[PDB]
Design a protein around this motif. Structure first.
Motif, short mmCIF file in Angstrom:
data_model
loop_
_atom_site.label_atom_id
_atom_site.label_comp_id
_atom_site.label_asym_id
_atom_site.label_seq_id
_atom_site.Cartn_x
_atom_site.Cartn_y
_atom_site.Cartn_z
N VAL A 106 0.84 -1.20 0.00
CA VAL A 106 0.00 0.00 0.00
C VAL A 106 0.87 1.25 0.00
O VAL A 106 0.62 2.19 -0.77
N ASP A 107 1.90 1.27 0.84
CA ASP A 107 2.83 2.40 0.92
C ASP A 107 3.59 2.60 -0.39
O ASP A 107 3.71 3.72 -0.86
N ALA A 108 4.10 1.50 -0.95
CA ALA A 108 4.84 1.53 -2.21
C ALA A 108 3.95 2.01 -3.36
O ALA A 108 4.37 2.84 -4.16
N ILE A 196 12.90 1.36 -9.54
CA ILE A 196 12.57 1.90 -8.21
C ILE A 196 11.47 1.09 -7.50
O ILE A 196 11.62 0.73 -6.32
N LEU A 197 10.39 0.78 -8.21
CA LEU A 197 9.35 -0.11 -7.67
C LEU A 197 9.92 -1.46 -7.22
O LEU A 197 9.61 -1.93 -6.12
N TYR A 198 10.75 -2.08 -8.07
CA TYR A 198 11.38 -3.35 -7.74
C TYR A 198 12.15 -3.28 -6.42
O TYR A 198 12.10 -4.22 -5.61
N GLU A 236 0.77 -10.78 -7.15
CA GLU A 236 1.04 -11.10 -8.54
C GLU A 236 0.84 -9.88 -9.44
O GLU A 236 1.53 -9.74 -10.46
N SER A 237 -0.09 -9.01 -9.07
CA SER A 237 -0.36 -7.79 -9.83
C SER A 237 0.80 -6.77 -9.78
O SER A 237 1.04 -6.07 -10.75
N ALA A 238 1.50 -6.71 -8.65
CA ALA A 238 2.72 -5.88 -8.53
C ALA A 238 3.80 -6.38 -9.49
O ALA A 238 4.37 -5.60 -10.25
N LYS A 239 4.05 -7.70 -9.46
CA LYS A 239 5.04 -8.33 -10.32
C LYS A 239 4.68 -8.17 -11.79
O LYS A 239 5.57 -8.03 -12.64
N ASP A 240 3.39 -8.17 -12.09
CA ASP A 240 2.92 -7.98 -13.45
C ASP A 240 3.22 -6.57 -13.96
O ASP A 240 3.65 -6.40 -15.11
N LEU A 241 2.97 -5.57 -13.12
CA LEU A 241 3.27 -4.18 -13.48
C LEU A 241 4.78 -4.01 -13.70
O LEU A 241 5.20 -3.39 -14.68
N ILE A 242 5.58 -4.58 -12.80
CA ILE A 242 7.03 -4.53 -12.94
C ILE A 242 7.47 -5.10 -14.29
O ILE A 242 8.28 -4.47 -14.98
N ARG A 243 6.93 -6.26 -14.67
CA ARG A 243 7.25 -6.88 -15.95
C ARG A 243 6.98 -5.93 -17.12
O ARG A 243 7.80 -5.81 -18.03
N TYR A 268 -4.24 -1.13 -4.61
CA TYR A 268 -3.48 -0.82 -3.40
C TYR A 268 -3.45 0.67 -3.03
O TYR A 268 -2.94 1.04 -1.98
N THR A 269 -4.01 1.51 -3.90
CA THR A 269 -4.27 2.91 -3.55
C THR A 269 -5.77 3.19 -3.42
O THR A 269 -6.20 4.35 -3.44
N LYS A 270 -6.56 2.13 -3.30
CA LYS A 270 -8.02 2.23 -3.16
C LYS A 270 -8.40 2.69 -1.75
O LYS A 270 -8.61 3.88 -1.51
#
Ligand SMILES: C=CC(=O)N1CCC[C@@H](n2nc(-c3ccc(Oc4ccccc4)cc3)c3c(N)ncnc32)C1
Length: 452
Positions: A106-108, A196-198, A236-243, A268-270
């Motif tokens: 959530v913070d990230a 940076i996200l990674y 899995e959605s975080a990893k997907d965005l990173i990809r 996660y920003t909801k």
């Protein structure tokens, strides 16, 4: 035409940033505080003509976004550019993150949303950052909810990136492969934000290595994994965005704008765990980067001092036209002014008034021009020396007083100091084969690595 020192006075030196030193300044009429980046025309080559830079400056002044540093004014003289903007007091993002109890997806996500929002805005206006990294992310205030301000948008387009390792520190991790090859556009900023996200979610760079060139090799290849244990606790959605952000071909890479709409940013920003390993790894990462940085800056200041010490002695000797070794207050001032007239204008000495003041600060300590030189130069080096002691104490998280030979390898590797050269230096200092150095030993190692 307007002169910068006619309008502003220096307060504090805030630090070294890309392309220049940053000074807290104050308007001489209104008392308005501002942060000023001072770019030396000597130290930095322009990539564009004057007309194109002026045009960019004019646009930057009109742009407004809550996640982008606001520029107020621009000045140019013989030797300098002055970029005057809003002061932010919350420091660098990563420094705030390491001093937190919990950190979650959530913070990230809240962090990345802000970055992406700022980037999206600037890409709409045809401005690319190209050098985006954690240190480019300032927090607006000391507040816990405070906004991220991206600094330095538009600089890398007009100014050539320094080749000195002192300035290159930590850049290699974040650079998009296509920047290395010369054909790049706005997508390169999405790549850097992906890196940076990674790091935010694992505490480790996706492309790593024992030295600068080794990191660039991995970047050029474009391969990375989510193999590290701490990725198990990540959606899995975080990893997907990173990809999507770390997609090799820029035309296949997600835009800043579409990243804003991605499932991960939306959700996660909801009910979300704390990435404890990531906080621990970022703290290690940051400490490592800052000590390597302090070490190189310390060596540089030492060299700069040696250079200036001799030159100042040579000015005070020529001025001593009666040969006694002592001088009066007015002589010291005119001599010190000569030093900056020849060696180039100093950060904390923007005008003749600043020098007069600095001389008086030295004289208030001295209660013999050789003793003036000593204290004067000591005051010039103070901030690099204490930055070194502090980064050393920061790195030594167990308060053991020592750093191992393994830790040194990592520090020197990030500093891009030849492995065989520092090992050589380590042998001369660690005659006891302790496999570790205390601060004073560490400092002797650095003095030996800059010809002393
Ligand atoms: C712990 C170290 C820390 O925080 N640092 C490290 C030391 C410097 C600090 N810094 N820098 C700026 C700033 C000021 C001017 C600027 O020029 C523009 C360049 C392009 C376009 C518009 C302006 C860029 C950045 C800056 C600032 N504004 N406010 C506060 N700190 C700043 C941040």
């Amino acid at each position: 035409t307007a002169i910068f020192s006619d309008r502003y006075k220096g307060q504090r030196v805030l630090g070294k940033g890309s392309f220049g030193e940053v000074i807290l300044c104050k308007d001489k009429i209104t008392g308005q505080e501002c942060a000023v980046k001072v770019i030396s025309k000597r130290q930095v080559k322009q990539k564009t003509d004057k007309e194109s830079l002026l045009r960019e400056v004019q646009l930057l002044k009109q742009l407004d976004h809550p996640n982008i540093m606001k520029l107020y004014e621009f000045f140019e003289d013989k030797g300098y550019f002055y970029l005057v903007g809003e002061v932010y007091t919350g420091g660098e993002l990563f420094d705030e993150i390491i001093s937190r109890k919990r950190f979650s997806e959530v913070d990230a996500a809240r962090i990345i949303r802000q970055v992406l929002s700022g980037i999206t805005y600037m890409h709409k206006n045809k401005i690319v950052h190209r050098d985006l990294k954690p240190e480019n992310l300032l927090l607006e205030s000391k507040s816990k909810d405070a906004n991220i301000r991206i600094i330095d948008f538009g600089l890398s387009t007009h100014f050539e990136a320094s080749k000195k390792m002192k300035d290159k520190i930590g850049t290699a991790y974040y650079i998009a492969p296509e920047v290395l090859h010369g054909t790049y556009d706005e997508k390169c900023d999405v790549w850097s934000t992906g890196v940076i996200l990674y790091i935010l979610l694992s505490g480790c760079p996706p492309f790593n290595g024992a030295n600068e060139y080794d990191i660039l090799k991995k970047v050029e290849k474009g391969k990375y994994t989510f193999e590290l244990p701490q990725w198990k606790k990540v959606s899995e959605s975080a990893k997907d965005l990173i990809r999507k952000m770390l997609t090799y071909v820029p035309s296949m890479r997600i835009s800043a704008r579409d990243a804003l709409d991605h499932e991960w940013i939306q959700t996660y920003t909801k009910d979300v765990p704390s990435l404890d390993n990531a906080i621990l790894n970022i703290r290690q990462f940051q400490g490592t980067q800052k000590l390597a940085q302090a070490a190189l800056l310390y060596m540089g200041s030492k060299l700069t001092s040696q250079d200036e010490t001799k030159e100042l002695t040579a000015i005070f000797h020529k001025m001593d036209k009666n040969g006694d070794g002592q001088l009066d207050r007015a002589e010291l001032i005119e001599g010190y002014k000569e030093l900056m007239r020849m060696k180039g204008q100093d950060a904390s000495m923007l005008d003749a008034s600043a020098v007069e003041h600095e001389v008086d600060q030295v004289l208030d300590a001295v209660d013999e021009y050789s003793e003036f030189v000593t204290v004067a130069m000591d005051r010039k080096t103070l901030l690099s020396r204490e930055r070194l002691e502090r980064a050393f104490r920061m790195f030594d998280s167990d308060n053991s007083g020592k750093i191992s030979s393994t830790e040194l390898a990592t520090i020197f590797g990030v500093s891009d100091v030849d492995s065989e050269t520092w090992k050589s230096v380590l042998s001369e200092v660690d005659k006891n084969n302790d496999g570790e150095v205390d601060f004073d030993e560490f400092q002797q190692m650095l003095l030996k690595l800059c010809g002393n």
